[PDB]
Enzyme design. Structure first.
Site, PDB file in Angstrom:
ATOM      1  N   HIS A 106      11.831   5.081   4.495  1.00 19.15           N
ATOM      2  CA  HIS A 106      10.944   5.521   3.411  1.00 19.15           C
ATOM      3  C   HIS A 106      11.695   6.138   2.220  1.00 19.15           C
ATOM      4  O   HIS A 106      11.192   6.124   1.097  1.00 19.15           O
ATOM      5  CB  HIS A 106       9.899   6.491   3.981  1.00 19.15           C
ATOM      6  CG  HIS A 106       9.197   5.913   5.185  1.00 19.15           C
ATOM      7  ND1 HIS A 106       8.331   4.841   5.186  1.00 19.15           N
ATOM      8  CD2 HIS A 106       9.434   6.234   6.493  1.00 19.15           C
ATOM      9  CE1 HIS A 106       8.032   4.546   6.461  1.00 19.15           C
ATOM     10  NE2 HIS A 106       8.697   5.359   7.295  1.00 19.15           N
ATOM     11  N   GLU A 136      -6.870  -3.517  13.122  1.00 17.68           N
ATOM     12  CA  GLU A 136      -6.639  -4.566  12.120  1.00 17.68           C
ATOM     13  C   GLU A 136      -7.933  -5.243  11.639  1.00 17.68           C
ATOM     14  O   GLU A 136      -8.087  -5.480  10.443  1.00 17.68           O
ATOM     15  CB  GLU A 136      -5.653  -5.611  12.661  1.00 17.68           C
ATOM     16  CG  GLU A 136      -4.206  -5.100  12.809  1.00 17.68           C
ATOM     17  CD  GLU A 136      -3.521  -4.654  11.499  1.00 17.68           C
ATOM     18  OE1 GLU A 136      -3.925  -5.067  10.393  1.00 17.68           O
ATOM     19  OE2 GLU A 136      -2.552  -3.869  11.570  1.00 17.68           O
TER      20      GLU A 136
END
Ligand SMILES: *[C@@H]1O[C@H](CO)[C@@H](O[C@@H]2O[C@H](CO)[C@@H](O)[C@H](O)[C@H]2NC(C)=O)[C@H](O)[C@H]1NC(C)=O
Ligand SMILES: *[C@@H]1O[C@H](CO)[C@@H](O[C@@H]2O[C@H](CO)[C@@H](O)[C@H](O)[C@H]2NC(C)=O)[C@H](O)[C@H]1NC(C)=O
Ligand SMILES: *[C@@H]1O[C@H](CO)[C@@H](O[C@@H]2O[C@H](CO)[C@@H](O)[C@H](O)[C@H]2NC(C)=O)[C@H](O)[C@H]1NC(C)=O
Ligand SMILES: *[C@@H]1O[C@H](CO)[C@@H](O[C@@H]2O[C@H](CO)[C@@H](O)[C@H](O)[C@H]2NC(C)=O)[C@H](O)[C@H]1NC(C)=O
Ligand SMILES: CC(=O)N[C@@H]1[C@@H](O)[C@H](O)[C@@H](CO)O[C@H]1O
EC number: 3.4.17.23
Lengths: 99, 593
Positions: free
Chosen positions: B485, B355
């Site tokens: 998705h 991150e």
């Protein structure tokens, strides 16, 4: 942008110094008074202007810009904008966007 | 004329970077302190931001795109003058959003009921995925697997059949031949003196690269099958396609949950340092300060100061309602922060590098115009995060950061447990990732008609993946649509391209780092040249194409999969020895029923 020899949106349209400037520039971080969480839109700036300034022109003149060939009588719809914007100063801004 | 568009975009940037800020701030403030007042306050900020961006799109249309000489002002007009939606009749715009909101609610709220106990019912994540992650009962798994498709997938099928019409009318009205090509549009490059790239050319470079992965994958498949025959005797043929309900989740997307069943050398404990972090008494501040020391050690800039106070690394001391899902946040005005709730763990030490590696990307293109402050393509943006976690996961890093002892030794058997655990995540998904996109590219163009949607899917699971239906299926199902998705309308091809680019970037920085060993041992530390080649690509944002950003880092004008295969050559050399007496690849004719 604030010097002799320097260029930019302020240095073309807001605050010019002569390129052989007799003097100095001083600046300090003011997040702790100029900014509040609501967005301190109090401070304005000339985002648009025709031609260019001379050194030390505090030209308060405020009328709509207009680029290329269009007439403009307010409304500021397309190719013409009101010349000033506010600074969106907030105490949570990053260092280069602080006041 | 062109110079008016420069001034129009200067207005847009100074308006947008502030509207974007207080909108994304209200979104942050909601995510960290959840109340219905905060929901309302973030939603009507997101509303007033959206209302500005669509007004500016009809005012951007006013400019002739073909007259623009400048390429940078042209990208900014092209990205703002886009119509995307609206082109439809407004009742078909309303119907499309109604269908998307309906596929979204059916996927998320979807309950599966136990036929033994019709008073007990499971959502997707709690209990129903958990059987697929941790059960070894073939029939309990098969029950969860076929019940998801027969209870929830059958509701998404009749919605998908109307969504495919409305998406293609919109793509055509935007002049793309189908909505699969509308998505591909991201990768399009024009007019840049030999760096150009076509929407269709992605499909050929995917299919050219993927068959260089097939030799590695077919031995990994054979090795996984030879191990799964001990977990599931008689249920698996030694030449069979693998039954889908056995593959570690509801779809078989990653094989990584099979590590404990497939392990090479499990009596050698695959390394941990979580025990070292708690015995050295580290905290959320230390975890991120030793991560910062890595980026300044490679010569990149440090945290944007106000990051440390305005980020949230820990779940509060107040019993606060917040989403603890780890997320790098950019909110504009140089205001970079990171929302997570860390617990002292090496998985979190490595997520801290992952991150922070997103924040480190955003900061480099902060000097670009606002409309260009994104990655060079949708794949690069996670790939530039992961190469930091690859560095930090090494025993060379962990002994330099004090998490491993100077007398800790790496044995070959630890290396092969590691590379197999990686391959089940990095390589095992690549057939699924090419194949699901191939199926949607074939559905949106109509190469698969609605009387073949489910017929073709299971022929492709069998041919491309080597994976087979546990139970027969028909055109009243939609097994593709039984997934986030596909039901939430998200283009998946970014994962294939990002999983290629990742190892190109790795091996280019390894050469700069003078790396003396195998590619997987490589650490991005104390290296200077690597940081300089990295930063000179990171600071380009969208302003230059991904096709040029690649020859800046790697030296190549297009994607190359050799580096990924060169991460795995020590493992592939081992898998070949583990397959000599075995059968490699699969029979498409075999079925478990
Ligand atoms: C149009 O292209 C020119 C160059 O092709 C860009 O010009 C540069 O602009 C920056 C300021 O933004 C100056 O510092 C450079 O010295 C200029 N270099 C050259 C060679 O012109 C210009 O920025 C482009 N237009 C836009 C809107 O970005
Ligand atoms: C965007 O959609 C419009 C239709 O709503 C397309 O047609 C434009 O119509 C507007 C009037 O509403 C005209 O001012 C434009 O000249 C038309 N298009 C142009 C610029 O030729 C328009 O083609 C679509 N734009 C895109 C991105 O293709
Ligand atoms: C790890 O390294 C050891 C050491 O070389 C390997 O053991 C050798 O294996 C071959 C093949 O069975 C034998 O011919 C050698 O005699 C072994 N060496 C010794 C010293 O006994 C071992 O095979 C390697 N393991 C893996 C998975 O690669
Ligand atoms: C990699 O970088 C670290 C951090 O600067 C170096 O660690 C130093 O190592 C020397 C001797 O090994 C110690 O005297 C210093 O105290 C260490 N510095 C810190 C901040 O801990 C390390 O030497 C570098 N590696 C190489 C090969 O140069
Ligand atoms: C590249 C750079 O200047 N990095 C600085 C470092 O020099 C300084 O010691 C540290 C203190 O917080 O902050 C960071």
């Amino acid at each position: 942008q604030i010097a002799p020899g320097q260029t930019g949106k302020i240095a073309d349209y807001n605050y010019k110094l002569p390129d052989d400037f007799t003097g100095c520039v001083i600046a300090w971080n003011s997040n702790n008074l100029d900014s509040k969480v609501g967005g301190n839109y109090n401070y304005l700036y000339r985002l648009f202007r025709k031609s260019n300034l001379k050194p030390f022109e505090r030209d308060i003149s405020t009328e709509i810009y207009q680029a290329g060939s269009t007439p403009c009588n307010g409304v500021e719809g397309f190719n013409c904008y009101f010349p000033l914007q506010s600074y969106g100063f907030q105490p949570t801004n990053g260092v280069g966007y602080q006041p | 004329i062109e110079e008016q568009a420069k001034t129009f975009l200067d207005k847009f940037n100074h308006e947008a970077e502030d509207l974007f800020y207080q909108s994304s701030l209200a979104s942050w403030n909601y995510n960290t302190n959840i109340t219905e007042e905060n929901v309302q306050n973030m939603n009507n900020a997101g509303d007033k931001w959206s209302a500005f961006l669509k007004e500016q799109s009809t005012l951007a249309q006013m400019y002739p795109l073909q007259e623009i000489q400048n390429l940078t002002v042209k990208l900014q007009l092209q990205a703002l003058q886009q119509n995307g939606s609206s082109v439809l009749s407004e009742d078909k715009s309303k119907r499309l959003n109604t269908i998307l909101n309906t596929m979204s609610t059916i996927y998320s709220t979807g309950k599966v009921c136990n036929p033994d106990n019709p008073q007990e019912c499971l959502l997707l994540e709690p209990g129903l995925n958990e059987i697929m992650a941790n059960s070894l009962d073939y029939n309990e798994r098969l029950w969860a697997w076929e019940s998801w498709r027969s209870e929830v997938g059958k509701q998404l099928r009749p919605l998908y059949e109307e969504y495919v019409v409305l998406k293609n009318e919109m793509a055509r009205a935007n002049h793309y031949e189908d909505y699969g090509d509308y998505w591909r549009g991201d990768y399009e490059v024009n007019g840049v003196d030999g760096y150009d790239y076509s929407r269709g050319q992605l499909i050929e470079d995917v299919e050219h690269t993927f068959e260089e992965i097939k030799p590695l994958y077919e031995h990994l498949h054979a090795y996984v099958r030879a191990k799964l025959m001990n977990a599931y005797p008689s249920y698996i043929s030694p030449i069979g396609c693998l039954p889908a309900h056995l593959l570690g989740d509801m779809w078989g997307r990653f094989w990584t949950n099979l590590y404990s069943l497939t392990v090479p050398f499990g009596q050698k404990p695959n390394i941990d340092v979580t025990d070292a972090m708690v015995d050295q008494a580290w905290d959320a501040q230390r975890i991120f300060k030793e991560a910062e020391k890595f980026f300044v050690s490679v010569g990149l800039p440090n945290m944007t100061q106000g990051f440390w106070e305005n980020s949230m690394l820990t779940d509060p001391g107040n019993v606060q309602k917040a989403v603890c899902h780890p997320t790098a946040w950019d909110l504009g005005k140089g205001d970079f922060r990171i929302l997570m709730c860390t617990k002292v763990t090496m998985d979190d030490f490595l997520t801290a590098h992952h991150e922070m590696g997103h924040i480190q990307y955003d900061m480099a293109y902060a000097a670009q115009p606002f409309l260009l402050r994104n990655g060079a393509n949708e794949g690069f943006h996670e790939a530039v995060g992961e190469i930091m976690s690859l560095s930090a996961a090494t025993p060379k890093h962990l002994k330099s950061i004090g998490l491993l002892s100077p007398d800790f030794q790496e044995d070959n058997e630890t290396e092969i447990n590691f590379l197999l655990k990686q391959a089940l995540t990095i390589v095992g998904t690549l057939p699924f990732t090419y194949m699901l996109e191939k199926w949607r590219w074939m559905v949106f163009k109509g190469e698969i008609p609605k009387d073949q949607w489910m017929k073709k899917w299971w022929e492709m699971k069998r041919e491309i993946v080597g994976v087979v239906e546990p139970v027969p299926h028909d055109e009243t199902y939609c097994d593709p649509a039984s997934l986030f998705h596909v039901s939430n309308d998200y283009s998946f091809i970014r994962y294939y391209t990002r999983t290629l680019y990742q190892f190109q970037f790795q091996e280019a920085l390894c050469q700069a780092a003078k790396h003396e060993g195998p590619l997987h041992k490589c650490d991005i530390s104390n290296s200077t040249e690597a940081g300089q080649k990295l930063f000179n690509m990171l600071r380009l944002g969208k302003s230059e194409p991904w096709t040029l950003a690649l020859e800046n880092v790697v030296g190549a004008k297009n994607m190359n999969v050799r580096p990924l295969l060169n991460y795995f050559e020590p493992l592939f050399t081992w898998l070949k020895d583990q397959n000599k007496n075995s059968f490699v690849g699969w029979s498409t004719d075999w079925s478990p029923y």
